[PDB]
Design a protein around this ligand. Sequence first.
Ligand SMILES: [Mg+2]
Ligand SMILES: [Mg+2]
Ligand SMILES: [Mg+2]
Ligand SMILES: [Mg+2]
Ligand SMILES: [Mg+2]
Lengths: 205, 134, 260
Amino acid sequence: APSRNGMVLKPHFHKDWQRRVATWFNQPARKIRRRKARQAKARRIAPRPASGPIRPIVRCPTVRYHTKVRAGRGFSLEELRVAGIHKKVARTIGISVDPRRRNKSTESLQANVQRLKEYRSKLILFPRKPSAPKKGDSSAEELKLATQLTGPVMPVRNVYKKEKARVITEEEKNFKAFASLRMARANARLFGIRAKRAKEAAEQD
Amino acid sequence: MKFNPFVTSDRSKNRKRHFNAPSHIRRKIMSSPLSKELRQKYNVRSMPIRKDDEVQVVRGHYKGQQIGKVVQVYRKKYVIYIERVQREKANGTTVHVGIHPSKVVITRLKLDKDRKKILERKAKSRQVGKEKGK
Amino acid sequence: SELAGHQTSAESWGTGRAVARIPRVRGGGTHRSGQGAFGNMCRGGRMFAPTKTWRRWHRRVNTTQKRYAICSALAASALPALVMSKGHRIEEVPELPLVVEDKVEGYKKTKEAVLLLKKLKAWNDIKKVYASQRMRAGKGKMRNRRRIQRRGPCIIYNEDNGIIKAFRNIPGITLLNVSKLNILKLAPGGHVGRFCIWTESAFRKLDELYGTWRKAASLKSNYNLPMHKMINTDLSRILKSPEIQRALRAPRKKIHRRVL
RNA sequence: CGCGACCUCAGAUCAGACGUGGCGACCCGCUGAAUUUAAGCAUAUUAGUCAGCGGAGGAAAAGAAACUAACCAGGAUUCCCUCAGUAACGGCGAGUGAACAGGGAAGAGCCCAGCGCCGAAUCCCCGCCCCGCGGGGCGCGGGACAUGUGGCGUACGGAAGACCCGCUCCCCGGCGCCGCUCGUGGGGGGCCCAAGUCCUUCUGAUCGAGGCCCAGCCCGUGGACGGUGUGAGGCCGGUAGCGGCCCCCGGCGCGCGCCCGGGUCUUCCCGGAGUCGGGUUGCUUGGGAAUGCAGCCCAAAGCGGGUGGUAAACUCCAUCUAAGGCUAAAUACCGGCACGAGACCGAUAGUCAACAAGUACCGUAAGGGAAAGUUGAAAAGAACUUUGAAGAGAGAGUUCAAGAGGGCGUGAAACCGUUAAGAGGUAAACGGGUGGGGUCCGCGCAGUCCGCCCGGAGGAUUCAACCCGGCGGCGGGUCCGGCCGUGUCGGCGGCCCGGCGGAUCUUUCCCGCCCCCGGGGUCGGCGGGGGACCGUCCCCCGGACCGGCGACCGGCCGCCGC
RNA sequence: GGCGACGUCGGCUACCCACCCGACCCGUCUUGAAACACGGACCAAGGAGUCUAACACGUGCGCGAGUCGGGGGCUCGCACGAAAGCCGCCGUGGCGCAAUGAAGGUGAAGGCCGGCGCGCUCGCCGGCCGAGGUGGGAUCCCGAGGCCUCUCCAGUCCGCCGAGGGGCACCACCGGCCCGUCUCGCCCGCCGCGCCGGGGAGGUGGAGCACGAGCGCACGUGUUAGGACCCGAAAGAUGGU
RNA sequence: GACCUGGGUAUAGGGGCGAAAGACUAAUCGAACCAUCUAGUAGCUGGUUCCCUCCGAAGUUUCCCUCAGGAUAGCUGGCG
RNA sequence: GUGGAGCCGCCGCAGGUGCAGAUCUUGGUGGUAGUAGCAAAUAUUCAAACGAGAACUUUGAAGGCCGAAGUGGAGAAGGG
Ligand SMILES: [Mg+2]
Ligand SMILES: [Mg+2]
Ligand SMILES: [Mg+2]
Ligand SMILES: [Mg+2]
Ligand SMILES: [Mg+2]
């Protein structure tokens, strides 16, 4: 059943497979169906934008992916706390809330606190009957457009430092090398043992 | 060119709505034109035919200039019978023959109260399109 | 057929009885009682390879070839030979890139937009199209395609102000927006050189939409109009040049037949 | 003992309600084989599928972490692309085989028990009337439940009370109604462009040809269908943010009904058990020193518990808060009620069925289950005369055709009948070479060469030869007017009123940051926003060579037509 | 050069007949068919290498150290449009550009000249360069010489050209480099002096480098998983009458 | 006479029933019938549909629960 | 020649694309062939009738068999 040189093959068709198959003869029909549910939804509601709330800025989980920025889930309260808005007020204003999200940095915390007040800067509200509790005049002179698109404040913005040019100094060109890693790794798998060999000198008495 | 999606274009289906058509829709598809003068007095194009209208026969074996009323309108077999056009059988008995009313000209109508509401509504709705061009 | 011929309980008769070993249906009574059941051989049988709906219907062509093949389909609409050798009759018409002004798009009643086609003498082609109103040869006449129709010119435009109305009743004609072109409608049958009528607002955009060789295009991101493998393409002007006929051996024109 | 309160209970054709059954395409729970592959075959595979059993819905299931991670941390579920035919499992053989990252579709969140405060502030039924539709309510009185605990506030993201301080009186459904509806909502019925005008063919036109200079006519209508044959115009109708007519949808404003949130400080409260886990046994998974599931035994604790993918002990840390509950979209649909389309099949095909098809018929029964379309435009479906008792004829008649005569269009081959031509002891038939006969074909018939040139003869024209008059081309011409190729610069000319880039350059520039004792030091960079500069394509003058399919002009030679 | 019609001229086909010669009935497995091997009475229609998944190579095309939108999105509420076009601050991803080890991990540059530390077989500094070298090697270059009507006064050209040069791809070979290891010897470093790091010289194992050729699409062939070229069992299991 | 028989009634598929023969259990019995998994599997038979052109074999070696089979090497064409 | 409404060249594309065989499937027809056969239970004959038509239908006469555990008279089951 095999012949002259070729791949060895395990094709997974020993199981019954012709009674579960899924031809996508409706994937054009499902694309222009779920465009009607974006046409006749984003006009049906409001001058509120399409594509949902403001999402915060979020840095990725894998070592592979920690260098990059992603539209996360919700500002996890603290960003509602340093910026100072009420949590059940926030999700009717148009601000997403994700309570099980934590903050264990101060660098990333203020990165959304300015973002939230920046959203609150570019927000205009409609008071019901124009007595205006804590909203200004005529509707920002007008609503200027009907709907906004693909995210409020461009949630990617994968910005990068310029770091233009420098003069190599004395300390920078002599030290920071490969041997600073082989001894760095040697204080990762020869550190706990050297805690134990100093216990040998405290029991030598 | 047809742009309305919810109506057919296939030969094998408009025949099924034609040969198996209900019998009051069937009087609509058996409709005859009005004559060249009589479409200008009553300013309307064509009409569903009925039992006491005298008209000449235009395309067939029996062509032209024999104005004489119809006698019986077989809706089922898409055929009217006109009092002049007949055929001697092999018996010597004379029977009518059938001619489809889209090959037939009304040269005088019968009017009643129900036809005036047709000859008004079908005539009002042509000067609707003439006043589209304001 | 979803499941044809297998909707039948049958088996081989097995033993002797002087019959072939095809499966026979069971029972008694009716006619279809001992006949040959499923198998491509038999009447009322499942066909060989009952076709599946998951044939690879749709094909891929990568985008740069779809853009190479449509640069190559517009340039053949400029040469006075290729657009006549396809079948379009541009015999009495002026300049092959027919460009009319933007006032065509304000046509809203087709009495107007026909004597556009007459005054440009482009009506010598639609007079041919009425002749090609035949009926289909074969068994297509019951699959609701019945009338063959020779394709005519295509008016290519942008910013419709009614021209999609007063041209969509003329037979054989096609109207395609100069933003969103189509290789299938610029070359009917894969035979290059369909005749086209342009418009000022359409004809000017192609320098900024397919670009040139000097720059790139601005309405497509990563495209430049492709390279031309022959700079000087007429070899009859090349093979009769003094660089070559200085270098050649000589011609050699005796016949030297078979000597007895 | 008799009466009574309860507790566990019965009985009823008590009053009023409820559940079973059908379908099962998709969904949920459970039970679940073998053929097959391994070239044998026990593990494995086929497969957690087929069958069986039960549950529902227009979707169901799933769901707001007892998570994934181990770095700069993500953040309910579901689905698709990738992860990946990879880790891992396996007579480590055959073969099976996830998930996290990451990009998208959609993105909605919440409730309770418990610990506590409020004098059950809770609910059902019954009767009356408020007053309103086709009915549901707050009132008014009477029977229950319930203290073995109803209702408000409350949920782990913290909460509650007392303070203190600074803002604010809302929201909620309905109501007869008036104005919009988004394709302008949905459903229903009746309407809306233009030729039969002339000739002509046919049995019949829908065919052929014609319609002066406006192209016979209408085109937002040339899709399709029937109509005696091929029809934009003869008719249904196609087109149109076309009209009018009827019925129903979500969203005005009087009379309803509920109706104080916010930040700090102080104190107080803070959680689901035969459950978690362990031992063993079966199934299962890629889960491998047991991933899930279930049985039986042992059975928890509170700085406790679950998890951290190699058994275990110690030691830190990371994350999470279980044994209680609801929830829209994204998703699945070979059953149905409707639809639309097809590089489909076209009566031995396509479903089993184009037709009185799950019908005739068979079997005791489960169950098996067909063959079968066409006269013609119109039945005009043969009146009538004649032989026969009739079946059937022969005449006559209809129609374009009975060479279409009631399973009747086209009518093939095998096979049969007769006529005709030929032939006959090795069965016939075949291959090769002729001969003889015939049917017919052309040839067409001692009647076949045909076109150029030239010399004769009659016969009748008219350009040529020459030239001006002529509109048009070809060929080289000074590129003189307009041309474009690649460049140097300049005018940066529009850069600060070009276009686009560049991980070029810009702490003296523009606010909001961190650092530093009501303000400063750029005090270094941030988020943001300029403008200086490089590279490349746009107007101008100068410079390059051919003025090339980039062409008009005049000038010339040499054509050509009238 | 010569000869002839109203029945005569030329000609065959799937026409018939006669004759001479050669001639056993096809399909099929098989060393061996006409076989006393088997299927075939005769016609009509139906009837058997398919479709997907995957890999290989061949070839065609587009782009090329890259490539590819397949999954989403945008573009009136449009027949053909279930198309086509566009995105790129949708390149996430896939395959490729880097290999090797069980793994922790590590991870592919030389050539010359000057000179120096005891040029110790061992070693080091400055510069130019830069994929090393031997042999073949199509092509290209130089080319002595040869080439024309009288002997000198010369030119682009052409024509063979002995030798000699720069030598593409590829082949044989020697040398180097990366990684795993093995043997042998000293040297250097210090986010902090150790059962730490880095190293050199020879020998070997590798699906490697030594100036990249891949990806996508399409087609053909081959091999497999699929009812898998059509038709064929004795059986097996589940649920029923 | 352990006799013959109508009707009623009981037992069902690895089950029933048997004065035993592997009989009988709806013309079927050393495991019934029907539908499904199912188009189950076969190294074994039968078949395999147009013409011309060009090239044109092998039944041998090694290994296999291998001997009617495959692998491999050989012979062969196609592309260069 | 029959027949009465469709069809084909060329350039591309796409297949359910070609039959002499499968004890092939389905429909059709032959040689056999006017042949095997219409032979279990004894057996029919004459005239008249209605009839276009008489061995077989009816009527009569005669000769027969079944022969009371019937080739007789009535039923249950089954058939409709
Ligand atoms: Mg045909
Ligand atoms: Mg329901
Ligand atoms: Mg048929
Ligand atoms: Mg691909
Ligand atoms: Mg069994």
